Design a protein around this ligand. Sequence first.
Ligand SMILES: Nc1ncnc2c1ncn2[C@@H]1O[C@H](CSCC[C@H](N)C(=O)O)[C@@H](O)[C@H]1O
Ligand SMILES: Nc1ncnc2c1ncn2[C@@H]1O[C@H](CSCC[C@H](N)C(=O)O)[C@@H](O)[C@H]1O
Lengths: 375, 375, 122, 122, 227, 227
Amino acid sequence: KIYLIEHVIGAVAYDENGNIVDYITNPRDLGKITEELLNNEKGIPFSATVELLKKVNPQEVVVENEAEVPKLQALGYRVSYEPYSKVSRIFRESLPKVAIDIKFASNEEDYYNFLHELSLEYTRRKLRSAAQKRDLLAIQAVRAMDDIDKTINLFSERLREWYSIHFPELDKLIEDHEEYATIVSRFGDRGFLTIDSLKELGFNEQRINRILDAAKKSIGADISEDDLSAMRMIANTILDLYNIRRNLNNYLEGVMKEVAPNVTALVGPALGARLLSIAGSLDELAKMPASTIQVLGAEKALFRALRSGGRPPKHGIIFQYPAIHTSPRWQRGKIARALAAKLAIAARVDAFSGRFIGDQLNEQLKKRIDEIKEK
Amino acid sequence: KIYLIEHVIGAVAYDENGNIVDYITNPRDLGKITEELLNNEKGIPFSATVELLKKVNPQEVVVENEAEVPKLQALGYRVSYEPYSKVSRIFRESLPKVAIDIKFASNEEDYYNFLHELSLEYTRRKLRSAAQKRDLLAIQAVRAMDDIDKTINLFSERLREWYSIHFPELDKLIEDHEEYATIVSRFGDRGFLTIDSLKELGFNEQRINRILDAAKKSIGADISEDDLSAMRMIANTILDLYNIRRNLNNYLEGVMKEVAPNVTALVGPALGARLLSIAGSLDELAKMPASTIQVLGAEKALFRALRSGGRPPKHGIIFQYPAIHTSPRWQRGKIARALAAKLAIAARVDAFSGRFIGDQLNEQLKKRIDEIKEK
Amino acid sequence: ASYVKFEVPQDLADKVLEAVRKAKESGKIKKGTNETTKAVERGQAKLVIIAEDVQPEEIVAHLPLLCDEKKIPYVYVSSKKALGEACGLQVATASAAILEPGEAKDLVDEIIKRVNEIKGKT
Amino acid sequence: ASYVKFEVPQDLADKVLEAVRKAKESGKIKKGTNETTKAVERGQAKLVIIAEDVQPEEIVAHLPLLCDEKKIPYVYVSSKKALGEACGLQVATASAAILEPGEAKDLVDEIIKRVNEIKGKT
Amino acid sequence: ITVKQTNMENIYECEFNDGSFRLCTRNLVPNFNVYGERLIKYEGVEYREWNAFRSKLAGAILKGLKTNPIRKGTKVLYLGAASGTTISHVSDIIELNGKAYGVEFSPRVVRELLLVAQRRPNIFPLLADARFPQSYKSVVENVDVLYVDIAQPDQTDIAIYNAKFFLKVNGDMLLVIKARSIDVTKDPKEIYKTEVEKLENSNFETIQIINLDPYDKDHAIVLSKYK
Amino acid sequence: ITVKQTNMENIYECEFNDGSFRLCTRNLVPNFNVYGERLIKYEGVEYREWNAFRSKLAGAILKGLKTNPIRKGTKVLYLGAASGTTISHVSDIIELNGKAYGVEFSPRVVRELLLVAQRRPNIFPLLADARFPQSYKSVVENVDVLYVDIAQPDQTDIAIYNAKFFLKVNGDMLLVIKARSIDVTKDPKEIYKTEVEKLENSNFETIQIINLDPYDKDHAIVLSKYK
RNA sequence: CCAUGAGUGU
RNA sequence: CCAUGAGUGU
RNA sequence: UGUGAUGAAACACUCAUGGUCUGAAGACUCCC
RNA sequence: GGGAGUCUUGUGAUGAAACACUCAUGGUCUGAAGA
Ligand SMILES: Nc1ncnc2c1ncn2[C@@H]1O[C@H](CSCC[C@H](N)C(=O)O)[C@@H](O)[C@H]1O
Ligand SMILES: Nc1ncnc2c1ncn2[C@@H]1O[C@H](CSCC[C@H](N)C(=O)O)[C@@H](O)[C@H]1O
C-alpha cells in the first residue's frame, strides 16, 4: 500500500509509516506547475505522478483528492483517497525541508522565492478566469441602468421645479418626463413654442392649443437667456440619459439571452439581470431555493420579519413582474410564489448548461396565473 | 369722529354708532381694484377714499391699517387706526348686503361672481412677483449642481467597478474621476493605449509608462467592442456632467454676486447659494440668528441634541468652508461660530439693501481665525 | 437712520433704559442681537429695545419686521453703549429684549402704551 | 443521467427508502427540492436523497455541489414516485432530506458508510 | 355599492362592493377630482371619496366629532388652505350658497390651489400671511366657521387674532393643534392642554377635543365657540 | 514621540506628541503603507501604525490577549485574508523568516491583496475557497498558527477542517467568531458559547476568549490549542 | 431628524 | 435591515 | 399541487410648511 | 501667594455629534393542501 502526495515540489510516494519510498521532482518552471495545479483541480494527475506510479508498481494506492481517483482507475490502478491523512500531514510537517532533500531547490532561501512567485502567478491566473465570466457584464450593465433610472428621475424632478419659475403651468400639463424635457430643451422661453415644432413630437391638435394658451396667460417669471440655458443644460442631460438607457436595455437583452436564456424568457432581460446582481452570479442564483428568489431585494422587510416574527414580504425585486404589481393584493403572494418557483428551475437549467426550455416554463406559469385569477 | 372703511366694495365712512355717514362706490373693474389693493399694502389710500375724505370734512379720522396713517397725515388730516374695531366688524357683518345698498352690484349673485374673479386675479398677480424674485434661480441652480455632484460620483463609482473587468489595474492608478473617464472615453480597449495619444492630454512622462506597462501585464478580461462601448456611454456621460457642472458654477457665481454679494464674498457662490436653499430665501436667511446659520444642514444632529440634551453639531453645511474642515477638531467650533456671526451680518446687509461691505467682513473674519489658530 | 420706524423722545428713552436695569435685577432679559432675535422667534420677549447708532444699520434691520409678525412691541434708544452698559455689560449692545419684567411691570406697561400712542392706535 | 455522480445498487436504494420511512415516523424529514435545499444551506440534514428520473435534469443538479460545500452526504434512488410515496405523500418528489434519523440511526450510519466505500475513501 | 346621508349635512357614507365604509361628499363639479380621489355615481348623482388620511376634517368626523359646524350655505374662513385638499371638501359641503375664503402664504402651493379655485365659485383664494389679517381685510366678510390648520409655533395666537377680526360672535372655530410644529421637544399631550388654555383664557368655549390618531400623528383638533 | 517594545515580539507602542498610545509594527517594506496608516520613524527605524478599529488582531491585543502565538519566524495559515489589512501586520510581525498563506475566495478583493503580497515575500496569496483545503493543499505546508477570520455560517466547522489538514499538533488557532453572520437572529453571546463547544468537542483546548467590543460589534475571538 | 400637505421612478 | 473588510463626492 | 398548495410588510426618489445649539468670557503683562 | 494695569469680546467669548454615496462577504419567509 502506497500513499501518494502531490505538491508544487513534485510527486512523492510514502508507505504507511511515513517514509519516502520513491519520488519524482517537478521542473522548477512557473508555466508548467501552474497549469498542472489548475489541471489537478479537475482531477487530472501531475505528469510527475504518472511517471512515479510506473517506477513503483503498487497494487493499492491512496491519494489526497477524491477527483483524482477515477482518472487513475482509467490508467490501470486500484485507487482510493484519504482526506486529512496522517501521511499528508507527515509530508507537510517536513515541507520546509524535503524540498532540498528531493532537490527541488538548492536551499530554503529560493524554495520560497519560487513558491512566492508561483502563488503570485497562480492567483493572477485565477483572477483572470473570474473576470472572464460573461454574467459579470450583465450585472454591471443593469446596475448602471438602475443608476440612470434613478438619475433621470432626480433631474426631471429638479428640472420641473426649476423650469416652473418661468412656466409653472406646463408642469401639470405634461405627465411624461421625456416630453417635458424635450420642451425645455427645444424651445427655451415659453414664448418660443410653436405649433409644428410641437406636432413633430406627436402632440395631438388639441394639446398643442392648451400648452400655447397656458404659455400666453402664464403667471410665470420673465427671465434672461442666461437663466434659461442653465435650465436647458439639465434638459439636454435628461434627454441624453434616455437614449443611453434604451441603448443599455438593448445591450443588456443581448447578453442576458446569451448568458441566461431561460430566466430571460420568464422575466425579461432587466429583471433577470437584476436578480443576477442581487444573487452575485448565475451559479449563486441557481443554488437558491425559490423562497429566497421570491424575496431578493426586500431584505429590510425580510429581516424585520425574521427578528420579530411578524409578517414577511410577499415579493422582493420580483414585484416588477407585470403579473404581480397589476394584480390585486391577495393574488400577489401566490403569483410571486409560483414565479419564484419557476425562476429557480429556470436558473438551474441556465446555470448547469441546459438548452432553452423557457417556452413551457412560461406556459406552465401563465396557466398557474390564469387559475389564480379565476376566484 | 369718522371711522373709515376700505374694501373691494369701495370706501365707506361710519360714525361711532355704526351708521353709514357717506360712501363712495368703487368702479366694477378688475384691473383698477387689484392695483389699489396691491397699493394699499404699502399704505397708499384708495382713490375712492381720497374723494370720500373731501365730501365729508372730518376732524378726527380712524382707519383700519397702521400703514395708511402717515399717508393721510401728509394729505392734511389728523389720523389714527383701530385694529379689530367694532365698526370694522359692523361693516363686514352686513357685507353680503351693503354691496347692493351702495350699488356696487345689482344683486348678491354677481357680487360674488366679481369677488371670485378679483380673488383669482389678485392672487394671480401675487404669485407672479413671488416667481420674479432673483434668489430663486440661485437656489435652483445650486440644487441641480448638488444633484450633478452626486451623480458624477455615482457614475464614476460604477464606471470603475464596470471598466475594471477589462483593465483592473487602472483604478488605483488614476485617483481623479475626470481623468479616469477621459481614458475609457477615448480608448475602450487597453491595447489602444499609446504614448502619443496619452501625451495629448498632458499625462506626465513617468505616469504614461506605468499605465502602459499595467495595460501590458494586465490580468483583465478580453472583451468585445459591444461590451466596451456600453461602458464608454457612462464615461462620456461623466465627462458631459463635469462640463455642465463648471458651466453651472459660473452661472451661479453670476447670480450670487448680484443677489447676495456680501454672503458670496464670505463663503463663495456655491456654499452661499446652499445656505439660501436651506433657509428658503435671502430674506429668510437674513432673519436668522447666527446660532441657526451655524447649524443649517445637520438638522438630524441638532434635534437629536435638543431632544436628549446631548452634544450639538458645531457646524452644518458651513463645514464646507475651507478654514473649518482643514482645521483641527478643537478649532472648528470657534471658526464656525465666528463665520456664522459674520454670515448673519452679511445676509442682512444683502437683504435690507445694496452696499458691498464684504472686504471688512472678510478682514474681521480672518483676524478672528488667526487668533483661534494661535493656541 | 432708516430702520428706525418712529420718533422716541428722550424722556421715554430714559424710561426704557431704567426699565431694562430693573429687569436685570428682578426679572429676565436677553442681551445682544442674536439672542434678541431668538427671543422674538420664540415669542418670549415682551418688549424689544433697539439702538439707533448701529454701525452697519442692517444688523438690526430685521427686528422691526420680525417683531410685527410675532406682535411684540419694540422701542429705540439713541446709544448702543448706553444700552449695553444698562444691560450690566461693560461693552456696547445693538439690541436687547425683556422676557420677564419683574419689578418693572408697571414701568414697561407705560412704555408699551406710550409707543402705541406715538404710533397711532386708540 | 449526468447529475448522478456514482452508482447505487438496488439493495442500497431500498435500504435508503426504508431509512426515510422510519424517519417520517420517529424523526424529522424534509420533502421537496426547495425544502431539501434549505436543509443543506442551513446544515441541518444528515443525509440527502436525490431521484434519478427528474424531468428537467437540472432541477436537482445544484444539490451535489451544495452538499459537498457543506459536507453533507447524498444518495440516489431510481424512482421519484417511489421516494415521494415513501415520504408520506401520494405524489412524486425529486429530492428529500433526513434531518433527525430517530429510529433509523443505525440504518442511516450504514448507508453513509456504504456510499463512502463506493466513492473511494478508507 | 350604496350611498346614504349621515348625521351631518351633505356628508355621506358608502357601502362597497366588498363591504367597506368610506366618507364622501356631493361633487360640486361633476366629472372632476382635485387630488387622486375616487369619483362615485349612485342613483345618477356623483360623490367624491373623502380620504381621512389626507383630510383632517374627515379624520375628526371618523373620530366622532359631535356636531359639524360646516354645512349648507355656511361662510368659512379657512386658514392654511394649502393645495386645496380639505377646502375642496368643505366647498362640496357648503354648496354654491356658502363661501370659503382660503388664506395660504406659500406660493409654491397656492399654484395648485388656483386650479381648484378656478373650477369652484365657492372658494376665494388668497395668497397672504394669516399673521396679518389686514392684508385680506378688504376681500373677506365675517364668517360662521374659522377653520385653522397652519403649521406655525404661535398657530393658536394667529387663530385668535383672525377670530376677533372675522369670526361672528357665537360662531365656531375648528383649530388643528400641530404638536410637532409648535415644539418637537415637548410632549404632544402637554401641548394640547396649554393651547386649549389660550382659547379659554381668550373667550372660546371648548366644545370637543379630538385626537386625530391613526390618521394624523401628534395632532389634535379643537372645536370651540367664540363669545 | 517614543516607541518601545511590548510583551509580544515585534509589536510596539507609541507615546505621542499629545500623549496618546497606539500600537504599531516594524515596517518590513519601509516608505510603503497598505491601507492609509501612519508611517513613523524613531531612532532611524520605521513603524506602521496598527489601527485596532480595522484589525481584529490589534483589537484582541488591546483587549488583553494573554500570549500572542504569532511572532518572529512563525508559519501562519490565514483564512479570509481579504484586502490585506491585518495580514500585512502579521507579515511585519513574522519577518522574512516566517511565512503567511493568505486564503481568500473573493476576486474583487484578492485584486487588492495581490498588491500587498507583491511587495511582501512573507505572503503567499491564494484565490481559493477555504471549505476545500484540497484546492490549496499543493502550495502550503503545515503551520504554527491558524488565523481564521471568515464570514460564513459554518465558519467554525471550516476552521476545524483546515486545522486537521494544516495545523501542527500543539499549534494555535485564533478564530474570529462573527455572531451576525452565523445568525442575525440569535444572541451574540449564545453563539460564542456554542461555537467554542464545537472546538472543545473536536479537541481544541480553549486558552482565552475575548470580546472585541468598542472595536468590533458582535464579534469575539478564541485562542485555543490543537491536540 | 420629527410632523403635515402635494407628487415622481423601477 | 444587522455585522465585517475596502473605498468615493461636497 | 413537493418540478411547491396555503398564509404573508417590494424597493428607490422630489417639493412645500413648521419645530433650528450655548450666551461672558478668553488671552497677555508689570510691582513685592 | 498678595496687589495692578493691557489686548480681543453681545456687530458674540466659552463649551459642543457636518452631510451625501460605492464595492465585497455572510446572516435570506412558510411547507400540504386547494376549487
Ligand atoms: N403664517 C401663515 N399664513 C398662512 N398660511 C400658512 C402660514 N404658516 C403656514 N401656512 C400654511 O399652512 C399649511 C399647512 S398644511 C394645511 C393642510 C390643508 N389645510 C388641508 O387639510 O388640506 C402649509 O401649506 C403652509 O404654507
Ligand atoms: N469560504 C470562504 N473561503 C475563503 N474566504 C472567505 C469565505 N467566506 C468568506 N470569505 C472571506 O472572508 C473575508 C472576511 S473579511 C476578513 C478581514 C481580514 N482578515 C482583516 O482583518 O483584515 C471576506 O473577504 C470574504 O470574502
